[PDB]
Amino acid sequence: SELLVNTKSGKVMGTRVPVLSSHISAFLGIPFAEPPVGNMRFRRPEPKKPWSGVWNASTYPNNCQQYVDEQFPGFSGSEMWNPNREMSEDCLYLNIWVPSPRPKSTTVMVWIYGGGFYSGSSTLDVYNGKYLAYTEEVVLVSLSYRVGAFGFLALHGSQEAPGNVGLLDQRMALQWVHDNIQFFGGDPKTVTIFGESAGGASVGMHILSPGSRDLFRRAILQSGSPNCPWASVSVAEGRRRAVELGRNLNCNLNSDEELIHCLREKKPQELIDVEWNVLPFDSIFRFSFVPVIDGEFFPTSLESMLNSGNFKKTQILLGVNKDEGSFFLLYGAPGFSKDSESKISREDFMSGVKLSVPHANDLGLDAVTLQYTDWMDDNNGIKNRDGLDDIVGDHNVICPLMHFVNKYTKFGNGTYLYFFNHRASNLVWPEWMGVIHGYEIEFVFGLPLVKELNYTAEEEALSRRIMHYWATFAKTGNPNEPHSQESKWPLFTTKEQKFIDLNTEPMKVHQRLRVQMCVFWNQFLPKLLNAT
């Protein structure tokens, strides 16, 4: 049976799924680790004990315990990202979409979901890999990993809650793929990992961590980089937040042992109810439990690893969206609302700047303000709004990514950079938000090819062009079709620094993405803050 596969962990039975007037195989909910429940909470993941009989992989698995966005009840724009299955700590499973007939040794792509390390699900409609697997004929895998305190609580020095376990969950799934994907017709030697925001930062982290490098061939990072200011904390900061979390749950704080024991006796939702209370500052685009620079998963500081070339050298494809910051301003910055144009007063602009650069002294805040203020029209509510939007995106996603791309390219084997600036015609979010964080994903997964979703024909063409870039890159390490007719996406070099726009218009090439602002964030501001 085409739907029956025998793996080293045991046999699994898939299900036939329809896709674009055709069909393919799907193996949903395959376990790759033992349930991290009970006393295994906060601990590293243990490999799934092989099973007897046949595992039913016909339906999606539970989602990991996580905070749920209720900011706009019933609104599809926000709820499309929420868990669409039952939540449980028993959530370590993976999904596989296999072309029909089953391949013998084709390209593999593993998706790592984003969500600021505090949320995320592999089962979202926007992550359904059947379209991509079918259209580009690749084996598409989507993994899962613990988020929130469950996956990143960090009490360095301890073995019950070392930190980064959520990252180890990812690695274990990659290990499972490396060991069993052949049985599904996948080529374990041509695996490409890709993800967005926290997932993109994750991809970069596996590129850096020695213990992950051998498990994949190349990588794609979307709107996320390992060096982002929100993607990691020091061991001391991680410890402070863990203790503070315990303080919120009236725990005994005399020892790690006692703290960990107390937290383990709490129900999942109890940890989630107070998770946001441990942030050090009033801020936006900052999440409580994220990876920790432990000296283990990460040997040394991210920057020193990047400077010395201490990382996997291969090919990478990465990029950003035009308005990465709008979402986080809506949810927390004063003056922004979902149903208004959100024109920002000068006062609110100032408040926003402070929320955006929490680690800044007055001089730093002044530098940022001056850098993003048009002094010939400083009371222009639209410029203030758009200016704040740029500040958040530049600081949190674009400039950190540009720093990563420039450092990696010095030792890498090929870089491809993109700038996604197409706002979908069927977007339910307001116009002022522009090309939102995470809204290139629907194009990467081919949702536009689905007529009932109501995208324009041009948007379907873009989706197909993007899916082919991604799949072709995953297969050859070059997004371009050898001996092709269409325009060529040029390599990004240290000298030329070329990139392309990804939109419904004919491809255009540019150079030095957001260079003026990124010199500010990556060189000047840091010097200023350090000197003061």
Ligand X SMILES: *[C@@H]1O[C@H](CO)[C@@H](O)[C@H](O)[C@H]1NC(C)=O
Which chain residues interact with ligand AT3 by CB under 6 A? Answer: 69, 276, 328, 331-332
From edge to edge, which strands make up the β-sheet containing 186-196?
Answer: 15-18, 23-31, 93-98, 139-142, 106-112, 186-196, 218-222, 316-321, 415-420, 498-502, 509-511
x/- track of binding to Cl ion for residues 71-90 (CB under 5 A): ------x-------------
What whole-number distance in Å separates Cα of residue 515 and Cα of residue 66? 37
Whether the Cβ atoms of residue 455 and residue 425 lie closer than 8 Å to each other: yes
**Should residue 307 be labelled a site residue for ligand X when binding is judged by CB under 6 A?**
no
| Cβ-proximal residue to ligand X, closest one | 56
Binding residues for Cl ion, total number by CB under 5 A: 6
Q: Do the Cβ atoms of 155 and 260 come closer than 8 Å?
A: yes
For residues 384 and 348, the answer to whether their CB atoms sit within 8 Å is: yes
From Cl ion, ligand AT3, ligand X, none, interface partner of 159 (C-beta below 5 to 8 A by class): none
Q: Which tokens sit at 219?
A: 């990588």
User: Smallest distance from the beta carbon of 442 to Cl ion, in angstroms?
Assistant: 8
Strand order of the β-sheet with 4-7 is 4-7, 10-13, 54-56
Q: Using the rule CB under 8 A, which residue among 57, 124, 228, 367 binds a second copy?
A: 367
Active site residue 324: yes
Contact partners, residue 441, CB within 8 Å, separation at least 6: 126, 127, 196, 222
Tell me which DSSP letter residue 468 carries: H
What does the alpha-carbon distance between residue 349 and residue 334 come to, in Å, rounded to a whole number? Answer: 9
User: What token pair was written down for 363?
Assistant: 């001089």
> Is residue 87 packed enough to be buried (19+ CB in 10 Å), middle (13-18) or exposed (0-12)?
middle
User: Least separation, in Å, of the C-beta of 375 and a second copy?
Assistant: 5
Between residues 4 and 363, which has the closer beta carbon with respect to a second copy?
A: 363
| Cα–Cα dist 2/510, whole Å | 47
Q: State yes or no: residue 494 binds a second copy (CB under 8 A).
A: no
Near a second copy in 272-291, by CB under 8 A? none
Q: What is the dihedral sign for C-alpha 133, 136, 141, 145? A: negative
Find which of a second copy, ligand X, ligand AT3, none residue 531 binds, CB within 5 to 8 Å per kind: a second copy
> Which is catalytic among the residues 196, 275, 324, 442?
324
Q: Which tokens sit at 266?
A: 């709490």
Q: What's the token pair of residue 214? A: 């051998």
Given ligand X, Cl ion, a second copy, none, residue 508, with its beta carbon under 5 to 8 Å by kind, binds none
CB of 493 to ligand X, least distance (A): 8
Say whether 305 sits in a helix, a strand or coil.
helix
Q: Is 494 in the site for ligand X (CB under 6 A)?
A: no
Which one of 197, 202, 209, 356 is the catalytic residue?
197
Other beta carbons within 10 Å of 273: 14
What phi and psi, each to the nearest 5 degrees, are found at residue 25?
-95, 150
Q: What DSSP designation does 85 have? A: S
Does position 270 bind a second copy by CB under 8 A?
no
Query: In the complex, what is the shortest distance from the CB of residue 352 to ligand AT3, in angstroms, rounded to a whole number?
Result: 15
Q: Which is nearer to Cl ion, 96 or 161 (CB)?
A: 96
Bridge partner list, 500: 418, 509
Enter the DSSP assignment of 502.
Answer: E
Q: Is the CB of 184 or the CB of 285 nearer to ligand AT3?
A: 285
Interface residue with Cl ion among 4, 236, 428, 509 (CB under 5 A) is 428
Name the segment binding a second copy (CB under 8 A); options: 45-53, 85-93, 196-204, 367-375: 367-375
Candidate segments 132-140, 269-277, 366-374, 499-507, binder of a second copy by CB under 8 A: 366-374
Return the residues of window 380-419 that contact ligand X according to CB under 6 A: 413-414
- Interactions with ligand X, residue window 39-68 (CB under 6 A): 56, 58-59
2 binds, among a second copy, ligand AT3, ligand X, none (CB under 5 to 8 A by kind): none
Instruction: Identify what 308 binds: Cl ion, a second copy, ligand X, none; CB under 5 to 8 Å per kind.
Output: none
CA distance 389 to 420: 16
Decide: 499 and 510 in contact? Cβ < 8 Å. yes
Q: With binding defined as CB under 5 A, does residue 4 bind Cl ion?
A: no
What is the nearest approach in angstroms of Cl ion to the Cβ of residue 523? 8
Q: Whose Cβ is closer to ligand X: residue 58's or residue 345's?
A: 58
> Active-site residue numbers?
197, 324, 437
Contact positions toward Cl ion, by CB under 5 A?
8, 77, 402, 427-428, 518
Contact positions toward a second copy, by CB under 8 A?
363, 366-367, 370, 374-376, 511-512, 515-516, 519-520, 524, 527-528, 531-532
Contact positions toward ligand X, by CB under 6 A?
56, 58-59, 413-414
